[PDB]
Design a protein around this nucleic acid. Structure first.
Ligand SMILES: [Zn+2]
Ligand SMILES: [Zn+2]
Lengths: 114, 115
DNA sequence: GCTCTACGTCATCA
DNA sequence: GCTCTACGTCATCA
């Protein structure tokens, strides 16, 4: 029977990372590796990685988990993305982790200026 | 025998102004009163009256005629609005003809201000 | 550490 | 004298 790609031991996969994000990863390894497996809200994806609504809204581009808005169920649904997917897209977008850090810099100058 | 509200004479209403815009006006009177009856594109509505896409996209708020884009059938459809409806909404928005001018005035100052 | 839309402009592509 | 979307912050309201 198939094994978690992180630990090579667990055969019971985290339900969310597996069913929703297509990752053969166990709940414990997801906790141990947030740099890959942590779930980020849509808002966290824009502030951390400077992705736009059109790229995050693209059904064809990111897998996503939706939950009721924790502020109120009458508010727009919370959207959760897996860090490895969003990071990989942002690195292609801005050019690796350095490109991203240069774009970070670039905006502080903007906020300062403005 | 219902009459054009403008001339009170013609019995045959402009088919566009009547079917699409609900206006009991003959074609001849539409040409003689462009200040009420001229059809404006979506773009001329934003330029002339500072209405937004959300306003003009509201299906419940303006009648609209759609035509194929004259630049190309593959481009987004042309949308035609009747000046009297558009003008009346812009007069409420900006507070009359004077407020529309006052808003005109301020954007020129902005596009001198932006080098 | 919640999300959508709108303001706002203009360009670009369609 | 063609239209949509995107880029920008954001704020507001939901
Ligand atoms: Zn594991
Ligand atoms: Zn008439």
């Amino acid at each position: 029977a198939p094994k978690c790609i992180e630990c090579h031991i667990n055969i019971e996969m985290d339900p969310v990372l597996h069913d929703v994000f297509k990752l053969q990863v166990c709940k414990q390894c997801s906790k141990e590796h947030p740099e890959k497996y942590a779930l980020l809200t849509k808002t966290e994806c824009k502030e951390d990685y400077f992705l736009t609504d059109p790229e995050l809204n693209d059904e064809d581009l990111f897998h996503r988990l939706e939950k009721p808005n924790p502020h109120s169920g009458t508010f727009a649904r919370m959207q959760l993305f897996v860090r490895c997917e969003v990071e990989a897209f942002a690195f292609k977008k801005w050019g690796g982790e350095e490109g991203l850090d240069e774009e970070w810099q670039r905006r502080e100058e903007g906020k300062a200026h403005r």
